[PDB]
Structure formats: structure tokens, C-alpha cells
DNA sequence: CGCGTACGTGCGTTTAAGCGGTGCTAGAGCTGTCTACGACCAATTGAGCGGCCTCGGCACCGGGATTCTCCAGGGCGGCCGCGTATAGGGTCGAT
């Protein structure tokens, strides 16, 4: 249930990559360990009807 | 200390208090007679007071009912505040 859809220079996760949090998360031990490229995400998410 | 008003003060208008002069008689005050009522004395009698006793109306109280007295706590709104997020600026790397 990982799967990235990788084809020349697109990169996008159809199953998880969203971190919910580093605090308390052992994923940040993976982070630390596998070369990971962890960006923040803005909260802000505009509505259109 | 501050606000609001009610009473002091002055003036023009208006009422009756005061003066006093005069006349009338009602009622106070004086007087003269006659007596009904009160003081005063004596003898008799019971109404009123000290004493003595018994007894219950109320002082005393422990328990129970009540009638106030005070407050205390929970809820609800406001104000401040710690944490997280988000935008902005600055710095570093790449073209």
C-alpha cells in the first residue's frame, strides 16, 4: 500500500507520503535514516463552489 | 462636593388693625335676711386588720418544635495568555 508513480521527472504518491507529525513519530528516525524530503504543508485551503 | 430649589429680600397693591369716641345694659359685686347642713360629743357595734395555715399558680427546667439568620457555592461571562500556525523577510544557491 506504498505506491509512487515514477515516469522521467514526475513523482507523485498514489497511496502515503503525508506525515501526520514528527513529534512522537518513529518515522522521523526514517527520515533520519533513508534519505527523505520532508516539506511542510500549509494549512491554508481555499473553497470553490 | 455638587445639584436643585425654597425661602430671604425688595416693592407695589391691598386689607384691616388700631385709635377713640359714644351709647347700652348685662353681669359682677355688694348687701341683707333666714336656715339647712356640718362640726362636735357620747355610746354602741361590726367592718377592717394582724396572724396563722394550707395549697396551687407560677418559677424552673430539659426536651422538641420552629423560626428566623447568614452564607456559600455553582454557574456564566469576561479577560488574559500560552501555544501553534502562517505569512513575510532575509539569506543562500543556481543559472
Redesign the pocket.
Known sequence: RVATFRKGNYVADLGAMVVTGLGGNPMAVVSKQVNMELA?I???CPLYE
Open positions: 511542510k500549509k494549512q491554508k
